[PDB]
Nucleic acid binder design. Structure first.
Ligand SMILES: Nc1ncnc2c1ncn2[C@@H]1O[C@H](COP(=O)(O)OP(=O)(O)OP(=O)(O)O)[C@@H](O)[C@H]1O
Ligand SMILES: Nc1ncnc2c1ncn2[C@@H]1O[C@H](COP(=O)(O)OP(=O)(O)O)[C@@H](O)[C@H]1O
Ligand SMILES: Nc1ncnc2c1ncn2[C@@H]1O[C@H](COP(=O)(O)OP(=O)(O)O)[C@@H](O)[C@H]1O
Ligand SMILES: [Mg+2]
Ligand SMILES: [Zn+2]
Ligand SMILES: [Zn+2]
Ligand SMILES: [Zn+2]
Lengths: 97, 338, 592, 502
DNA sequence: AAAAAAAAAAAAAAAAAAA
DNA sequence: TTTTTTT
């Protein structure tokens, strides 16, 4: 599990980011590294908590993101050339060409 | 608390109980016959007026330096005082306390450890204040004949100057200035309420090894209100009251902008060119009986700063100079010098 | 005790209808207060009865009730309030306003004012008089009075009274049709509550003679006494003592052997003249006397006093939308050797002005972390609080560097913005500035120009409205007069009337300039333009700037601000131009 | 038991909703404004009605207006029931069952924070202040559906409170609610939730007393409608909140002086004391401080005025004369500022390389001639404008900076003045005075139209799409006619080529 | 069921200062 | 203008 902030280039100026928690199941382990900008496709789910209801006085719920796909987006902001999780990967016919 | 009295909504006799331990539990249902019945005749409550109380206070004592063996740290001892003897001693005095050396259970900590270890305390019985009494020059026959003898002595100021610090040789005029500093100048205001102070600000200047610090120590000894300060060593000397974060409950007890006993005190300072900008700002603010009104958290209870300033500083070269003195100076503002 | 219920009430009522303060007058050895004041209350609709103890002591039967009141405050006060409640009908014989209002009394002056250093347990549940300084406060705390309940199964609701805080909950709903025991559920938001506020009080410094530390006693107030005091106040209170058991471990039934001490108070004390103005305002020499009346102890220095007075009066502020608002404040700088008592002038003006903060070289807003509580609050600095008044600054040379830019921000726009910790906002200042600075060295050399000795940047000193220079030079005569004046003082002045006059001029009066004054203004501008040039090709500096025109417009408006006029005259503009040019005449350096 | 008062107020409420029948203008004979609101909901699937208090004021006088206003909490569900009745009478499919909300506005007065007292609990009220902090938008339970385990016996529409409540009985006669209940997440209905903090404005506070702080709870569509530093006016009902910790929970459990006005003696409390504190609940928030898309905004003036000024033939002739009428002279400067406001086309190649599409202007002059006036006017006119000095006391400088609390990780960045100016027109004053590091940052930033600073183990790329307008001053006071810009100004050579006009 | 925190040591970034 | 040192 890992902490996900907002991209500093995406937040409105002079504001504060919003954190979330992302849980990475099998085969997605260690794909993400600290300090990098990433894009994650996942499922939004909610769960009960005790201290959260304690500190607010209202029936509030916590939410975590179960990761399902991860795509790195560090530096290479040109994101219109092609689709896919990895744009630096090739098919067999691309190797043939 | 000594005895706790309840009331049970007209249950005839009202239950009394006593507690000597530092903790207890209250009562809930009384033993009267109408409440010995299956249900209570009115619920009982604690009654403050009928209960008994005693004045209580807590103090701790520290060993003297003379009695500490070499290479050791002094220890402390707690004292509990009750009854009329409360408020019979003040911090900062030598006393001879007689009391009862009693144990104290550790269960108050509620750690469940120290199965056989317990704390100890003393309960006061009779206190000898010892030390010395200032008495505020309260008149008596003996002091009256003493001042008669002084009047018969004739000329006084020269003898007083000679009698301050015979250890340091010479320097008569410095001692004369010390005499004139100890009495104070013109005071008690003028017409239209204009401010004037009787305090005198004299600065001592000279080479190292002239025993100006020793003369300052002698003056501090001979004066009752003297406070001695020097270059660094601690941060609580100025700008903060001594009760900052002091209580065990951490009540943030403070006064704001104040100094050490600045009201009618004698601020003796050594190494006047050593302190930082904060103490320098404070001593510019204590100028000419001006109060100290520095605020940090909405506090504005200013201290009425009315003190005489006597400070000793050394040249930044460590010696006098053939070239001009005001440029050599003491590395001090000309406004402060004036 | 059960003694005062029967006869003390009747005796107090009899002396209510029978009291005359002539008895107190005789006791003084140099009139029916209650009935006249009670009918005053009847015709007012108020609900309050102040009650002194000395005049209560003046009567021989009442002192018995006096002593019984010290022993038993609560019951005596309650029965006195009920007595007043019945006195309503006893005196009116509309009865409708009576049934709606409660009644309370405010005893005071019961006894000598004690201090926190001498409070023996003999003084528990006894009325005392206390004086001190209010330090801090707390948000108002709701108090449970009427418990609301609802039989959820049958939706039945019942209202329950309480006593001593503890609630006797209903073990079963009254509706025997359901008669269920466990269907009792309360509603938080349909109850009734009382407002409680806790104050922290400090002993006066008079009670600590030997440099010890003061102490703190907790306070409690109810209803009309809520928010009656705030931080820094000096008040005196009268209320009973109290002690309470401390819970210790909140999870356990035990209680500590010691009790917390706190007091509950019931009374707190602190510590058409417009016709007269015009009679004074009609005089011809109002200007000179008014100017000299604010610095009685200052010898000579008339022109700077006049300038400071006009700065205090202020100009006009307008907000026409076609070009944005125009600044209406005057800013003046003081310079010279520290032998002029120039801080005394700032001290005078600080207390003379309605609003103002006196500081020295942090002055603006900065977010702080709360000390007693753990929270974040936005805090505004000295400049923000001086809106509409005069902000006084000393030791202006020792201004550091970061803060100086802030001044350059505020003097040119009268608005300060902050972008920190996610907070972006703008705050209004709209304040006047008065500052003093010292030259570098033991003296200010007249040959030396002003700039280097005052070590301020040229733009900042150029953008002040005016400037004044004080130069003390040794002469036999002037020293003789100064020495004589100082000795005589050491060996015609109005009162807060000044403050109300200043306020009335500030907000009632909105003078405007007229067409005639425009010709004089433009002639003066052209004249100093010519005075700033010569026939030779030296390429003289342009000494007549637009700042001069703005300054003279503001000063002419200020001259009409005083004397309560509505339109300016020529005299205003001649005075303004002479004032603006006098400082320039002494602004030259060693050349020319 | 039937609260006939609630029934009566609900009947009157739905009645004046039905037939308010107010006319706005002469052409608007009968409008039925609330029917129009419901029509808007039908055509847009909206949820919340907005009710003006003044329209509610004269309806049945104080028999209805004051009755609703004072015991708002008491009669809120009755208003909800009447609203549901009328909407399902007129728009059944609109309910496709959903949480309708009502927001009252236009209250006759506003209260300061210092005037808050307990006697107004449960009453509609309006307060104003500055928001200093918000909280993340978290969901909260509204209507739950519990299963009684061994026999499911679905217990739906269970209401909640400040504590997570559970059903108390099992409707199945064979079952006897012995089995512990289990929540069904997919059947529960949640609602938004956000807590904000407010404090008194600087004008209300007397002396140097510390500001009074209060907490405000939002719900529904009013989330993220307030931002820190914005002075806003709220409308809602005053409430009181207990300490849930003393109350029973499945989880485990200035201030030291106590003396709280507590209460005890309850079954669930046991040997515990319950305290209370003041909180506000809000329902309405206001703040007091393509060419075809534009053409879609149709009006008679919108058509005619633009058509005339397009079909005109001296537009430019008048246009420059219409810029900053306050200033006198300086004809070309106005044209320059107009061109700066107009902006240039932004184009990006098919290689991901960005071409600058903005104009940057520098103005130089001798002291005290109108140059600050242009900057002030353009700041006052141009949207998203920022005014700042060349020398700034903030640690952010002009570009950006990193700030940490001591021993605080990640060195969270702070937006600089230029970063705030991003996505909009910027203004710079006193440009000659500059920070050397900031200067070497900006001159590479202007061409890149972005700035990126990597420090203290964190790195990021920021956007600075800004149009720069700056003013300088000749060295020596006045512009020496003999020399040139390079001789007169000390400002470095590469930056001069960054600017496009002088 | 809970000791939890003031006092130190060490690693930076920003600003201001001296050459 | 540059590097140093302090906060
Ligand atoms: N006039 C004197 N008579 C006697 N002893 C003297 C005299 N002058 C100096 N001394 C001796 O010098 C010492 C005190 O000088 P000391 O250097 O402590 O004082 P100082 O001038 O305040 O300087 P410093 O700051 O170095 O302490 C003592 O040992 C004292 O005996
Ligand atoms: N004209 C004067 N009248 C009365 N007192 C004066 C006069 N000039 C100087 N003084 C005395 O000399 C001091 C001058 O201090 P001041 O010039 O205010 O120093 P600074 O402004 O640097 O604090 C004052 O405290 C005052 O007592
Ligand atoms: N319409 C105008 N024509 C010419 N000058 C003006 C006009 N309006 C204001 N001014 C002057 O121009 C100045 C603009 O400020 P600025 O030129 O930046 O002064 P400085 O250079 O001293 O900062 C103002 O001080 C004002 O006096
Ligand atoms: Mg020495
Ligand atoms: Zn009983
Ligand atoms: Zn029932
Ligand atoms: Zn079941």
């Amino acid at each position: 599990r890992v902490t996900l902030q907002e991209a500093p280039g995406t937040v409105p100026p002079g504001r504060l980011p919003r954190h979330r928690e992302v849980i990475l199941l099998a085969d997605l382990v260690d794909v993400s590294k600290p300090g990098e900008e990433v894009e994650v496709t996942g499922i939004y789910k909610n769960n009960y908590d005790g201290n959260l209801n304690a500190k607010n006085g209202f029936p509030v719920f916590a939410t975590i993101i179960e990761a399902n796909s991860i795509k790195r987006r560090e530096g290479n902001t040109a994101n219109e050339g092609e689709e896919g999780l990895d744009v630096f990967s090739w098919t067999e016919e691309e190797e043939r060409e | 608390v000594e005895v706790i009295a309840y009331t049970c909504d007209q249950c005839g006799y009202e239950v009394f109980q006593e507690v000597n331990s530092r903790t207890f539990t209250p009562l809930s249902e009384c033993t009267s016959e109408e409440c010995s019945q299956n249900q209570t005749k009115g619920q009982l409550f604690m009654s403050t007026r009928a209960s008994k109380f005693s004045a209580f206070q807590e103090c701790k004592i520290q060993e003297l330096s003379q009695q500490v063996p070499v290479g050791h740290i002094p220890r402390s001892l707690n004292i509990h005082v009750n009854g009329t003897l409360v408020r019979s001693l003040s911090p900062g005095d030598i006393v001879d306390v007689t009391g009862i050396f009693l144990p104290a259970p550790y269960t108050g900590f509620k750690a469940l450890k120290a199965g056989l270890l317990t704390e100890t305390y003393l309960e006061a019985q009779f206190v000898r204040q010892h030390k010395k009494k200032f008495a505020s020059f309260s008149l008596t026959s003996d002091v009256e004949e003493r001042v008669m003898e002084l009047i018969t002595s004739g000329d006084v100021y020269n003898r007083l100057a000679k009698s301050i610090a015979p250890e340091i040789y010479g320097n008569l005029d410095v001692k004369k200035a010390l005499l004139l500093l100890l009495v104070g100048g013109v005071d008690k205001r003028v017409g239209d309420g204009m401010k004037i102070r009787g305090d005198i600000n004299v600065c001592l200047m000279g080479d190292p090894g002239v025993a100006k610090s020793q003369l300052l120590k002698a003056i501090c000894k001979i004066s009752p209100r003297g406070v001695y300060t020097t270059g660094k060593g601690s941060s609580g000397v100025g700008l903060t009251a001594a009760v900052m974060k002091d209580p065990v409950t951490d009540e943030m007890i403070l006064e704001g902008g104040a100094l050490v006993l600045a009201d009618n005190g004698i601020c003796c300072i050594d190494e006047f060119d050593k302190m930082d900008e904060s103490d320098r700002t404070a001593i510019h603010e204590v100028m000419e009986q001006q109060t100290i009104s520095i605020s940090k958290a909405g506090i504005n209870t200013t201290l009425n700063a009315r003190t005489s300033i006597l400070a000793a500083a050394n040249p930044l070269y460590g010696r006098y100079n053939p070239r001009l003195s005001p440029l050599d100076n003491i590395n001090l503002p000309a406004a402060l010098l004036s | 005790t059960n003694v005062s219920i029967q006869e003390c009430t009747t005796n107090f009522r009899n002396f209510l209808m029978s009291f005359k303060y002539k008895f107190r007058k005789i006791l003084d050895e140099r009139e029916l207060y209650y009935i006249k004041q009670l009918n005053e209350m009847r015709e007012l609709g108020t609900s309050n009865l102040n009650l002194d103890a000395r005049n209560l002591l003046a009567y021989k039967q009442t002192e018995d009730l006096y002593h019984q009141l010290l022993n038993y405050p609560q019951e005596v006060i309650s029965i006195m309030d009920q007595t007043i409640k019945d006195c309503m009908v006893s005196l009116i014989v509309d009865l409708d306003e009576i049934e709606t209002k409660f009644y309370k009394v405010r005893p005071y002056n019961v006894g000598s004012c004690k201090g926190m250093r001498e409070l023996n347990p003999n003084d528990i549940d006894k009325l005392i008089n206390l004086k001190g300084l209010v330090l801090r406060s707390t948000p108002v705390i709701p108090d449970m009075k009427v418990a609301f309940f609802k039989c959820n199964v049958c939706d039945h609701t019942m209202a329950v009274e309480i006593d001593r805080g503890v609630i006797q909950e209903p073990a079963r709903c009254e509706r025997i049709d359901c008669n269920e025991p466990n269907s009792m559920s309360l509603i938080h938001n349909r109850c009734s509550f009382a407002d409680k506020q806790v104050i922290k009080l400090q002993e006066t410094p008079d009670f600590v003679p030997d440099g010890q530390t003061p102490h703190s006693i907790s306070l409690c107030v109810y209803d009309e006494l809520v928010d009656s005091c705030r931080a820094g106040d000096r008040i005196e209170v009268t209320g009973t003592f109290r002690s309470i058991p401390i819970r210790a471990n909140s999870r356990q039934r035990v209680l500590k052997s010691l009790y917390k001490t706190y007091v509950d108070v019931v009374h707190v004390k602190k510590v058409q003249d417009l016709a007269k103005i015009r009679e004074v305002a009609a005089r011809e020499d109002l200007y000179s006397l008014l100017a000299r009346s604010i610095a009685p102890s200052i010898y000579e220095l008339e022109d700077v006093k006049k300038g400071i007075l006009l700065q205090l009066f202020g100009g006009t502020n307008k907000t026409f939308t076609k070009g944005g608002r125009y600044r209406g404040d005057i800013n003046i700088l003081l310079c010279g050797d520290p032998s002029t008592s120039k801080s005394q002038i700032l001290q005078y003006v600080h207390k003379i002005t309605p609003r103002g903060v006196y500081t020295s070289g942090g002055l603006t807003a900065y977010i702080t972390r709360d000390v007693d509580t753990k929270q974040l609050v936005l805090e505004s600095g000295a400049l923000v609080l001086s809106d509409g008044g005069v902000c006084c600054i000393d030791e202006f040379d020792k201004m550091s560097d970061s803060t100086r830019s802030v001044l350059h921000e505020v003097m040119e726009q009268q608005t300060i913005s902050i972008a920190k910790a996610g907070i972006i906002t703008t705050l209004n200042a709209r304040s006047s500035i008065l500052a003093s600075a010292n030259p570098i060295g033991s003296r200010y050399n007249p040959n030396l120009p002003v700039t280097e000795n005052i070590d301020l940047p040229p733009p900042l000193l150029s953008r002040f409205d005016l400037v004044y220079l004080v130069l003390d030079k040794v002469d036999e005569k002037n020293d003789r007069e100064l020495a004589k004046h100082l000795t005589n003082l050491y060996l015609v002045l109005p009162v807060e009337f000044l403050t109300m006059y200043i306020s009335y001029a500030k907000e009632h009066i909105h003078p405007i300039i007229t067409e005639a004054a425009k010709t004089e203004l433009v002639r003066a501008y052209v004249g100093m333009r010519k005075m700033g040039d010569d026939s030779r090709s030296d390429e003289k500096r342009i000494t007549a700037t637009t700042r001069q025109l703005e300054s003279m417009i503001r000063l002419a408006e200020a001259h009409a601000k005083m004397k309560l006029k509505n339109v300016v005259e020529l005299e205003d503009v001649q005075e303004a131009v002479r004032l603006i040019r006098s400082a320039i005449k002494d602004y030259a350096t060693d050349p020319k | 038991v039937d609260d006939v008062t609630g029934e009566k107020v609900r009947e009157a409420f739905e009645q004046f909703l039905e037939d308010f029948s107010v006319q706005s203008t002469d052409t608007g004979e009968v409008e039925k404004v609330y029917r129009a609101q419901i029509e808007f909901m039908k055509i847009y699937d909206l949820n919340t009605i907005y009710i003006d208090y003044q329209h509610l004021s004269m309806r049945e006088n104080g028999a209805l207006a004051m009755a609703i206003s004072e015991q708002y909490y008491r009669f809120l569900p009755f208003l909800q029931k009447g609203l549901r009745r009328v909407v399902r009478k007129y728009a059944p499919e609109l309910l496709n069952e959903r949480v309708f909300q009502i927001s009252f506005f236009n209250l006759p007065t506003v209260h300061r924070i210092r005037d808050i007292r307990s006697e107004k609990i449960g009453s509609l009220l309006s307060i104003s202040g500055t928001v200093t902090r918000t909280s993340e938008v978290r969901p909260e339970l509204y209507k739950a559906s519990f299963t009684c385990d061994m026999c499911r016996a679905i217990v739906d529409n269970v209401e909640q409170s400040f504590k997570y409540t559970e059903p108390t009985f099992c409707p199945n006669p064979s079952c006897e609610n012995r089995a512990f209940w289990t929540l069904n997440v997919t059947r529960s209905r949640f609602l938004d939730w956000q807590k904000v903090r407010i404090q008194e404005n600087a004008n209300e506070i007397p002396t140097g007393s510390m500001p009074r702080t209060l907490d405000v709870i939002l719900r529904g569509d009013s989330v993220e409608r307030a931002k820190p530093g914005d002075r806003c006016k709220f409308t809602g009902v005053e409430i009181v909140v207990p300490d849930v910790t003393q109350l029973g929970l499945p989880g485990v459990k200035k201030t030291t002086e106590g003396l709280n006005s507590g209460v005890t003696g309850l079954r669930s409390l046991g040997v515990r004391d319950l305290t209370y504190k003041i909180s506000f609940l809000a329902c309405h928030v206001i703040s007091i401080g393509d060419q075809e898309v534009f053409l879609n905004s149709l009006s008679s003036d919108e058509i005619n005025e633009l058509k005339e000024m397009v079909k005109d033939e001296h537009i430019y002739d008048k246009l420059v004369r219409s810029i900053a009428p306050a200033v006198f002279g300086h004809e070309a400067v106005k044209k320059g500022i107009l061109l700066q406001m107009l902006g240039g086309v932004h184009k990006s190649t098919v290689e991901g390389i960005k071409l600058r599409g903005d104009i940057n202007i520098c103005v130089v002059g001798d002291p005290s001639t109108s140059k600050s006036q242009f900057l002030k006017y353009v700041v006052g006119f141009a949207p998203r404008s920022v005014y700042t000095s060349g020398k700034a006391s903030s640690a952010a400088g002009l570009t950006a900076a990193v700030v940490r609390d001591e021993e605080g990780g990640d060195y969270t960045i702070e937006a600089g003045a230029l970063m705030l100016a991003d996505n909009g027109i910027c203004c710079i004053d006193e440009f000659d005075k500059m920070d050397i590091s900031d200067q070497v940052a900006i001159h590479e930033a202007m061409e890149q139209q972005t700035i990126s600073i990597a420090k203290a183990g964190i790195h990021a790329t920021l956007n600075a799409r800004t149009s720069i307008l700056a003013a300088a001053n000749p060295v020596g006071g006045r512009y020496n006619r003999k020399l040139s810009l390079r001789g007169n100004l000390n400002m470095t050579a590469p930056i001069m080529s960054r600017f496009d006009l002088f």
